[PDB]
Amino acid sequence: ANLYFQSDREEFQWLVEEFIRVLERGDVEKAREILRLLKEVAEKVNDPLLRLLFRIARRLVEEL
Amino acid sequence: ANLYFQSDREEFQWLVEEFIRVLERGDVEKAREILRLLKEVAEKVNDPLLRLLFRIARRLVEEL
């Protein structure tokens, strides 16, 4: 259970916002750490878009 | 109308896959061109996740 969010998809969106926040601050090490949380939640949602977002996010971390 | 896709969200996923394909081939100019198509479709969907995906994708293009 997670009372903060209606669904795993909503939790995913929250984590995406946090990922963006830390990477836009230049904290690349912390953005990389958030990738793992994104993947864990994406696995719970049967939406391929979430997996593709992870792929783009992971590549962005590599290019920063 | 668009007979290829069930919904704007599905079209968005298709464009995300194309974006990934061209950027992973190293065709950065074409990936940048796909950003505009992603934004146009994201505007039609009331899902903030699609807008956040655009934001990450656009930053990735800048960092390649």
List all residues 6 or more positions away from A28 whose beta carbon is below 8 Å from its beta carbon.
A61, A64
Check CB contact under 8 Å for B16 and A63: no
Q: Say if A32 falls within a structural domain.
A: yes
What is the C-alpha separation between B18 and A27, in angstroms, rounded? 29
What is the C-alpha separation between B34 and B51, in angstroms, rounded? 14
Closest to A62 measured CA to CA, from B33, B24, B34, B45: B24
Q: Say if A1 falls within a structural domain.
A: no
Tokens of A10: 């909503």
Judged on CB neighbours under 10 Å (0-12, 13-18, 19+), A56 is: middle
Q: Say if B2 falls within a structural domain.
A: no
Residues of chain A whose C-beta is under 8 A from some C-beta in B? Answer: 9, 12-13, 16-17, 19-20, 23, 48-50, 52-53, 55-57, 59-60, 63-64
What is the C-alpha separation between A4 and A29, in angstroms, rounded? 26
List all residues 6 or more positions away from A8 whose beta carbon is below 8 Å from its beta carbon.
A41, A44, A45
Instruction: Give me the number of domains chain A comprises.
Output: 1
What is the C-alpha separation between B27 and A24, in angstroms, rounded? 24
Range of the domain at A37: 8-63
Tokens of A28: 């690349």
Q: Say if A2 falls within a structural domain.
A: no
Name the packing angle between helices B48-63 and A48-63 (round to 10°).
30
Tokens of A55: 């792929």
Q: Say if A3 falls within a structural domain.
A: no
Instruction: Report the 10 Å Cβ neighbour count for A63.
Output: 12
Tokens of B10: 């599905």
Instruction: Please tell me what DSSP assigns to residue B45.
Output: S
